[PDB]
């Protein structure tokens, strides 16, 4: 009865969306054929597939997903891929022309000819759902289609539904390992759209994953398959509590009231641990003692921002496996004892605790083997100001004398809008500086 509708738009999301579902598929025992034979279980068990799947009355399960992109290239591979018989035949929206990495195209001219289908699909989707708890949307910010259609879609929801909480996982350009040349433009204007419209944002920069993959997995030539695997874990990591028995269940509704002190400060960064491959794992111990300790290692963070460069504002952790809760308290206490990690003055209690028994599931053929414990660290800190600053520094140099501006201007977007972006992006930064001051 507790269900969440997933929204995926853009090339960046689609593959990460591809990764999340497979593991989601694996965790329930629903093979790509669309069935859940299990140990010949027919009615002799609980009803836990509600959280991410819906019953059709006799047989298969239809995922609660809607897919959006303007280039049929990405959709086609999924439609003819290894999961061709699972997704709804028509809920896989396919476009006609590529967004060509331009925001103006993806937000004012070509993106307005497909939203109608998206909302129609979602409205019907919400109808089936009875215990809607929120929304999870995966999108990319460095692409015209990504920011554009995603921003427009999110805006539409804001008025259509309103108070329904939103949690979105975006992918900002890496600090230095970056591909697109006009990506910063789309990002900032994307930030304005989601700045005052989304509730919880989880930074998921790409470069950080590479080091996590290389250093710990000890892989020197990772591919896009590997990075997607990690993200699916966290996505499955954060929401797995709602659907399995746990000592202290935590609902997606219990993040806006426990992690965002102020309405505008709602940008947060993630990290994951433990990370161990299938070769050097069984000879290591993996105790709650150090697993928590490693989670706070700056080099292990899932984003390229040094937590040592700012105070800590609010934290939230979830435990899994056979963790004895008292073990949870012991790990936290010493962390406070350590002086390297420091909190702000106005947050007396800054640790939210939750324990879910189920062990993380392993998809064969991957990198992470079967461990008996793990922890997901999701914390909001004032240090994230730098990343917004660094993007701002890039914008100023490439906007001082109208770089590639005419491409965006001609599509209809007003020139003065960019002045609006600079005002909002810098305004948020100046907001963050004041927050960290001491009383």
């Amino acid at each position: 009865m507790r269900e969440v509708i997933s929204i995926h738009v853009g090339q960046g999301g689609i593959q990460v969306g591809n990764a999340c579902w497979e593991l989601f598929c694996l965790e329930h025992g629903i093979q790509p054929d669309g069935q859940m034979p299990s140990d010949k279980t027919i009615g002799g068990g609980d009803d836990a597939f509600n959280t991410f799947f819906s019953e059709t009355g006799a047989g298969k399960h239809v995922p609660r997903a809607v897919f959006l992109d303007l280039e049929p290239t990405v959709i086609d591979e999924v439609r003819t891929g290894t999961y061709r018989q699972l997704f709804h035949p028509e809920q896989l929206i396919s476009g006609k022309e590529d967004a060509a990495n331009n925001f103006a195209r993806g937000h004012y001219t070509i993106g307005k000819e497909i939203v109608d289908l998206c909302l129609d699909r979602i409205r019907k989707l919400a109808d089936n759902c009875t215990g809607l708890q929120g929304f999870l949307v995966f999108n990319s910010v460095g692409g015209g289609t990504g920011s554009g259609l995603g921003s427009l879609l999110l805006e539409r929801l804001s008025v259509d539904y309103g108070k329904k909480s939103k949690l979105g996982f975006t992918i900002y350009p890496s600090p230095q390992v970056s591909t697109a040349v006009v990506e910063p433009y789309n990002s900032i204007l994307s930030t304005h759209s989601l700045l005052e419209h989304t509730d919880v944002a989880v930074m998921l920069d790409n470069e950080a994953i590479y080091d996590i993959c290389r250093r710990n997995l000890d892989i020197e030539r990772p591919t896009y398959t590997n990075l997607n695997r990690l993200i699916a874990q966290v996505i499955s990591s954060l929401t797995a509590s709602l659907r399995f028995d746990g000592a202290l269940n935590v609902d997606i509704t219990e993040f806006q009231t426990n992690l965002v002190p102020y309405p505008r400060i709602h940008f947060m960064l993630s990290s994951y641990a433990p990370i161990i491959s299938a070769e050097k794992a069984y000879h290591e111990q993996l105790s709650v003692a150090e697993i928590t300790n490693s989670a706070f290692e700056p080099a292990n963070m899932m984003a390229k921002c040094d937590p040592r460069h700012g105070k800590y504002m609010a934290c939230s952790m979830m435990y899994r496996g056979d963790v004895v809760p008292k073990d949870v308290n012991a790990s936290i206490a010493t962390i406070k004892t350590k002086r390297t990690i420091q909190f702000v003055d106005w947050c007396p209690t800054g640790f939210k605790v939750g324990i879910n028994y189920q062990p993380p599931t392993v998809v064969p053929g991957g990198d992470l083997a079967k461990v008996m414990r793990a922890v997901c660290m999701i914390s909001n800190s004032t240090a994230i100001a730098e990343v917004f600053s660094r993007l701002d520094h890039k914008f100023d140099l490439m906007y001082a004398k109208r770089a590639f501006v005419h491409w965006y201007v001609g599509e209809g977007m007003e020139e003065g809008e960019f002045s609006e972006a600079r005002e909002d992006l810098a305004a948020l930064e100046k907001d963050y500086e004041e927050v960290g001051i001491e009383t």
């Binding site: 593959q15 790509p32 891929g81 290894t82 398959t225």
Partner: protein, 53 residues
């Protein structure tokens, strides 16, 4: 390049490049493996690493 080559000759006389033409003198009859690989997306998320095993 722009300057002419004084010596033309037939083949067999190792004068000029001679060696370069030899290299590949079999490669004209050297075969090349044809066919097109099986993509990247179809490589990782195959029927394996699923609920079938």
């Amino acid at each position: 390049t722009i300057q002419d080559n004084v010596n033309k000759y037939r083949f067999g006389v190792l004068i000029g490049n001679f060696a370069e033409e030899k290299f590949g003198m079999d490669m004209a009859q050297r075969q090349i493996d044809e066919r097109l690989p099986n993509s990247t997306m179809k490589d990782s998320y195959g029927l394996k690493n699923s609920a079938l095993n």
